[PDB]
Symmetry: C4
Subunit: 429 residues, 4 copies
């Protein structure tokens, strides 16, 4: 019964270590930033979410995005007394400069069919890293008009709605004030910096809050499919990077070294079914150990760069990405750490036909309704239908005969099979 | 156990043949075109979905529809360098010309009642093909003002929300550029090309995407009932017609001939309960065989016509219609082909009263709520109520006494009968 | 087994008689008229549903309502060739003239409390027919400014959202054209025809469709509570009044006399448990017999009046009211007539506590959330909660402590009691 | 069986006493006032709910709020004949003057991190009563620019969305007419009366309805977090304070003394399991006794003040607060009083894992989705998921891998554990 007590001590160790990272003021910080950039219309009624075509994109970029970044003067039109830096909502510092970057696809990327070769001289295929266009275009001069590899821009794969994307492309870094920035983007509308070759466009920038201590790092990802049009999407992550606050941070250093003491104790007692869960928990634990040194190194380097050369994009997106997935790992560890307490204290006919419906629904619908438009989405759509959440209008207007047949037939299937499962389990009794 | 293996080979045959037709880039192609034509307002705030009366229709036709068809210049107001053809979203070619066509009903189509014969000199009845008005009207000159049979316009029945419609009517084919087109439709507003006689108005046009290979064929169907007003509706189908891409298309020809080899094998082994499913699967299989020759002939002919005489409507709607229903057939075949693996490895009291509620609900509601407005819609509405999806406000504001009596009473009926079914099945145990 | 056959003959008799009244084109007729009057905004963005205060009402009455009534010219601004009458959507005749009528409450209707007698010289209480103000006001001249009893205006009780209302009040009948009408309502804004005394305002008018045969009779009821503000509400009923169409109407006369033959047969065989249902069905049958003579008399009289003196309100609202409730009666008869085929072929602990929750929820909520704002609404709200339809945000923002306690506690109550019912019924087995 | 009868007499006593307080016209009174202040946009499209930043707040305060308070002239632009007082909707008197009051936080409230000390000279921390800034600011002159304790302003804690707030702060009391008021708030925009130090801003005012007898007391609470931006929120309570109406009020005095007679009878019979419920009911009863004297004293004093010095804020918010919570207490008493009739006539595996999901969901989501943003909200969110109310899009866009794993895994957990509970209970049978 002593190993139990020690185990509890482990639960409060991991508990304080993971709840040390969070903040109850995070949610409103995301909510405020997102509702600042996403929802604010331009004069043309162009929000970010509602971007349709390219001209809408330019109406957005030269629109709110240049007035929701650079704040200078108060609401009473009196100047704000902090020099030359842009404070979003007066309370939020803007780190470095924002960066656009684009991805292009090669001029002739496929074979136009034989009938149309008269009217169509070019094929720009869907994005795949094999076909990415590395040559310059436009006036072919600055870093906006000429390619850059994934090394020259330190970066990882962004994984969007269509397909994953590399880290290269034609970046531009907006200058400090507003006016110079508008001169830039106006310069990119002059020439065509968005043409048929374009595929993905990223806008990255990050913000640091002085009052509490948090970063809001955000990516605005607009995709241009081969079909034309646009698909806007966004990721906004708020993150506690610097863990130094007060002597409490030194209590967090002590907490960390206590934690590694614990894990060494648990590898000692480990080596000599539930022990599966043990080796997992310890595995993700020691994965979580080194990340703090990784982080302190990273932050030290970045704040080094921002210190040296302002008006230069400094990547917080990689660091924020791995910080948040680090938090996900801690969450799963902690959850298992609660499950572990218990250690210290015919269906094939259903699955086959189930996937058969997933497939059928994907074929009949899926060029109409989004919820069916891929296979996994079909699986979870059918699962919600079991749980009693569905939109029948969509299924019914996609195909107004086979729709009701699908819906009804599926309902009777699940209902009926579930029944036979009940009667079988009662037969076991 | 060998016939099993051969059967699996059949499953991968049909599998690759049906998944050969689809594309994962289809959904966004429909989504983009539909959100281009349907949702874009005019200056008057007139979307397509929101069309109310005739003047709204004309505000739409001379509105966005002429600016969401003809694209000429880039977003920077630089000319686009492809000659005279209209590329929607710059990536999508426009095939031929768009076509309006109308259906009229005869001047005196019924008997005005005896009381009103003083104030009402005309009856235009509901549309039925018996009463379709074949005489010219207006200035009585062009092909817009004079009837055309269903042969002179190759076409099949469109089946809309009210009733099915023929393929005849008074067509107009818009010219190439925008300006000439606006001159046309302005010419049709000058005279009354929509008058009390009108019933259905169709706008048909189709689009071919060069980057991927797909067609988006779309019909915009606005109905004018006898009651006045309008009911806008639409059908948008994206279709892979030309299956020739690369040598992979030749692997698709080999796949097809392998498939017919399979079906001949299965008629040989067939002729000498589950065999019901066998004869069905083979039936729809051989139905699916000839459609490819039918299609290659059709496409060959059409692209022949578009080749010969541009600015002439060339029907892709018939071909797209049968291509999509062909895909539905393949979907059902494939689904059965998955079910078939298993071959190789008191209620009357409920139904009577159920339909009795369907009828009651249709009579009490149904001049108010849409979900009840016909009989089949009542059946599926009550079925959703069983599944726990309903809008109680509607039922309650239609009739605020009998509404709750209907809803409650029905709930207790289904609940209670289901109970007695449980207790009965437990009695069988 | 012969009485069975005769009974079936009864089912097809009542079946054809009740389905003779309906029309499948009704729903779109209501939908079109309602979306014409209710939803069309004015220049100020004032729809009918969105009416807030009195100035909004006047912005509506002189707004769309005078342009959604009088139609004169086509969409091409060419005159329409039917003399002086107003055709709504060109297909719908307007019967007679529209009528406003108001209800007033007496000057000093209650006792102002003792503290405020200095600042408040008048009390206008809630509407009850005892306090209705019968004296003239304003310029005190026309029929708009002077009272009229419920006899001088033939009319019945309208039953709205707050309380039932009589048929008297200060009516005004709008003239024929638009311009004279605007002169009228402008004349009623000049003086105050809506002042603190006002309680209910009705706008009644009816429309006859020539193409099909139906009436759309509609009431727009705006209520001004004692609290101030407004509560707009509406009733739109489409009705087949004249049943004369063709010789088929004579087949309907034969059908009626066959029906009365049947009911006499059933009183003969009746007089000499399920017979309860028999006497009910026959009762509502013979109630339904005389209504046709009542109706033919009524319609004959009305069309007499419209024939004699146009530009005079002629009530179709009484007749439409009883026609629709007649249709409800036929619906219930027919439903029982289907049930009748079978003739020819611990809870107190739950109900007490249930009503106890209805009461509690009414007291805690109900000055906030509408669904709880009266007692019956609380009953059906809790019933939906059992059926899994609820809005938790409302309950939670009304009182953010007792709300979740109510919701959770109720859920466990119903869940748990239902359980004990299951185990009890299994004990009976 | 006599104590039963006497008990019923108790039920009708408490019944008439609690139903004496309510009114069926309350709901529309809240609904009307709330839809007057909350939803009415300004010229800039700024509603109250939609307030985003500070400049939006000022656009609201000088916007509708000064035109939804002071009513002078009728809708026909004729003057209203009640002197100098402002009648909202002409039927509602405005009691006293409205009051703004603010809360500030100290200049340097925390330690800026070491890296940023160059660009950031100030930390304004989250609100806690320890850090509240008591010094004057701005021109440092009036009662708007200088602190006031919680005694000098009689007031209690407001408990908002973020944290509880004290009653002190920098109040301003708007003058009588509109013009002087606009001069005031313009004077507060001139200087910065909202600066980085601000945290909460309250607008309090109350309204008395003469026709019925009720008060609508309302607080408009706008919060400025440390993160920037705003969180608007509101409380609107309608209350019957003065219970004097007619001789019926004297029947209410008799009712009260009868009630205390009852409770003395029940302490006599009390002193000599269900008796737990007895001592509770009697406890809250005698708590409810003294509140009437407390109230009559309070109202007497207030109406004394409003009598003496108009244009001075007189607090009805404290009194309304305790009146409504008094009504909540009566509601619970009455509910128990209905329950009481009956007196006179393995799970740990589920709860542990349940809270484990609450925690996991709070960590993974909760910086994205609101429903998860705190721990209790996670508990009730998961409880609704059990009851079949959820938004899957949110969970899925927060984290698009771990989201479905959370949702599915939780569903199988609850489903499966519930099953084993069924089979266990059947084993007990
Ligand atoms: C707003 O600021 C501009 C900055 O140049 C100034 O010219 C203008 O007078 C200001 N308007 C005000 C204070 O109303
Ligand atoms: C295709 O694009 C390239 C850009 O890399 C350009 O140099 C070339 O001229 C284009 N081809 C044609 C036929 O214009
Ligand atoms: C841009 O083009 C001009 C024109 O020759 C050239 O002088 C300049 O160096 C170019 N910019 C860069 C960064 O090379
Ligand atoms: C837009 O194009 C028109 C075409 O004639 C031209 O006259 C005008 O100057 C252009 N406006 C620009 C480039 O801003
Ligand atoms: C009815 O319509 C026809 C069109 O086919 C027209 O020729 C005829 O004159 C119309 N009847 C009357 C009475 O105007
Ligand atoms: C249109 O009417 C004119 C007037 O006579 C005629 O010359 C012309 O041929 C008509 N158009 C056609 C296509 O017949
Ligand atoms: C619309 O009708 C009016 C009626 O007087 C007329 O003056 C005007 O010219 C017409 N406008 C057109 C036909 O565009
Ligand atoms: C009350 O209203 C009546 C209208 O019937 C009016 O004659 C009377 O003068 C009013 N009372 C007062 C005190 O103005
Ligand atoms: C309206 O008032 C005038 C003024 O005396 C009067 O002549 C006229 O008769 C009145 N109208 C009616 C319908 O009595
Ligand atoms: C509205 O009231 C103002 C108040 O001065 C007055 O000048 C104006 O003429 C009035 N407008 C009307 C009655 O239309
Ligand atoms: C901080 O705010 C106070 C207001 O209480 C002010 O007196 C002081 O000057 C501020 N500090 C600095 C460094 O400006
Ligand atoms: C406001 O400031 C002026 C300037 O000295 C002063 O005279 C006045 O008394 C101040 N107001 C109050 C209420 O003290």
């Amino acid at each position: 019964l002593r190993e139990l007590v020690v185990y509890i001590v482990f639960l409060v160790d991991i508990c304080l270590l993971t709840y040390g990272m969070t903040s109850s003021s995070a949610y409103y910080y995301t909510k405020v930033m997102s509702e600042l950039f996403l929802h604010t219309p331009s004069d043309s009624g162009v929000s970010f979410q509602t971007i349709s075509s390219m001209s809408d994109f330019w109406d957005f970029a030269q629109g709110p995005l240049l007035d929701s970044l650079y704040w200078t003067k108060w609401y009473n039109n009196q100047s704000l007394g902090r020099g030359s830096h842009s404070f979003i909502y007066y309370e939020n510092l803007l780190l470095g400069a924002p960066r656009l970057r684009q991805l292009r696809v090669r001029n002739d990327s496929c074979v136009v069919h034989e009938d149309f070769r008269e009217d169509i001289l070019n094929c720009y295929d869907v994005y795949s890293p094999d076909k990415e266009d590395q040559l310059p275009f436009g006036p072919q001069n600055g870093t906006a008009w000429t390619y850059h590899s994934q090394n020259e821009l330190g970066g990882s794969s962004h994984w969007g709605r269509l397909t994953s994307y590399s880290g290269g492309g034609y970046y531009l870094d907006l200058p400090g004030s507003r006016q110079a920035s508008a001169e830039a983007l106006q310069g990119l509308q002059e020439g065509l910096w968005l043409d048929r070759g374009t595929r993905v466009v990223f806008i990255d920038f990050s913000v640091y809050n002085a009052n509490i201590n948090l970063f809001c790092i955000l990516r605005l990802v607009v995709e241009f499919p081969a079909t034309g049009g646009t698909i806007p999407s966004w990721q906004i992550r708020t993150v506690k990077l610097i863990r130094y606050v007060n002597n409490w941070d030194f209590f967090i250093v002590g907490c960390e070294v206590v934690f590694c003491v614990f894990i060494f104790y648990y590898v000692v007692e480990e080596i000599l079914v539930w022990n599966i869960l043990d080796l997992v928990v310890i595995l993700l634990s020691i994965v979580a150990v080194g990340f703090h040194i990784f982080r302190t190194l990273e932050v030290n380097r970045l704040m080094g760069k921002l210190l040296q050369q302002p008006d230069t994009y400094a990547d917080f997106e990689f660091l924020a990405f791995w910080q948040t997935q680090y938090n996900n790992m801690n969450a799963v560890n902690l959850f298992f750490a609660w499950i572990k307490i218990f250690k210290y204290i015919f269906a094939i006919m259903f699955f086959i036909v189930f996937f058969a419906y997933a497939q059928l629904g994907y074929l009949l619908f899926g060029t109409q309704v989004e919820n069916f438009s891929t296979f996994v989405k079909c699986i979870f759509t059918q699962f919600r239908i079991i749980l009693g959440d569905f939109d029948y209008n969509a299924i019914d207007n996609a195909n107004r005969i086979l729709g009701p047949v699908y819906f009804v037939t599926y309902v009777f299937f699940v209902f009926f099979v579930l029944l036979n499962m009940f009667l079988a389990i009662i037969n076991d009794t």
